[model samples]
Target: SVPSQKTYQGSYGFRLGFLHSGTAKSVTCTYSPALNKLFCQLAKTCPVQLWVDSTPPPGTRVRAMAIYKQSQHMTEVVRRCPHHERCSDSDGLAPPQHLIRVEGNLRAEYLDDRNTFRHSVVVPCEPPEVGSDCTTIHYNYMCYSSCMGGMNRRPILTIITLEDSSGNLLGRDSFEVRVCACPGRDRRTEEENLRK
Candidate 1:
């Protein structure tokens, strides 16, 4: 299965968000110790909105930063979110907003050492299904279910989170990625996300 909301931590980690794009295997996360900032490169299906949170026993200072838009799509009929397209140093240029704040402190870490992050805290984050018709227009989720005469989606809220050394939450990175049971006949579409 596609990896569930993922994370990359530790000193010098990639896939933080700036490794790949369309047909990308992963996006690398970038950190600048000099600026005390971290972020990922923009990618396909990346949410238009994102935020950071602090996990556990919270009381920390987030450094400085700002987001800069460098997309070529804003000028086109089908442009992309500049956040996901720019390369080089233009990745997450947005101001410093802790990931923990946005996703919540699912994963928490102790800041006893300034040189290292004690542990990664879970930050709640997720993307919504079926947003404005302007987007998701091609998904045809109904058509996929209709052909089978019906479909079954129990609907669930599973919290995907991270924890601290003591098993406490520093943030909540929560979001929903539905699990769909396609009618037996809905085989053609399943192969589309793959390369020939």
Candidate 2:
């Protein structure tokens, strides 16, 4: 059975920071029609602010979760074969092996006299805790664009959920972001280059 596609729309925004000690700039995102998600481009190692415009009712809590899959590099033999040929026959490409998941409570800030709340989630380049399974190179460099065919450029999927005091779901929304050296590159161009 197909799952429901209903979700709260226009509930998320992103602010990207570039300088080490300057103000964070708001990012303009593009909407994906196929996936119904907002996509934003950001530079590697930059800290981003996740803004939630919707305010939960009293006695309700909001939580934010982020997930990303590590990219894989094809071996020489796999890269040498033609597109129509099955190269290694070992599941073709590797499955999602390194799936990183992180979640935290979203803090609310008072906006005006009406007691409105604007939630902001500060997402860092790396999660708060680093596990031993993660590569040391990625930990040291944060996000190096040079290694393993830009594996560090994998997109991060973020979801924000609202729940009542009894843990019942109220609403949910999500967005996608790619942290890389080239923030201005078109997504189509990146997809085409990956085929080479």
Number of the top TM-score candidate: 2
Residue by residue across 1-196, what tens digits does model 1's lDDT show?
A: 1112333231211112111222222332322222222223222122212223322233321111111111321121111123322323222321121111122122322122233221112222222246521111000011111112111222111122333445343322222212223211122233343324
Q: What TM-score against the true fold does each predicted structure earn?
A: 0.20, 0.34
Candidate 2 colliding pairs, count: 0
* Residue 187, model 1, lDDT: 22
Residue-level lDDT tens digits of model 2 in 13-88: 2222121221123333333333323333321122223233444345754444334422232111111113112323
Off by over 4 Å in 1: 1-152, 181-196
Best by lDDT: 2
lDDT of each: 0.22, 0.32
CA RMSD of all predictions: 19.0, 15.8
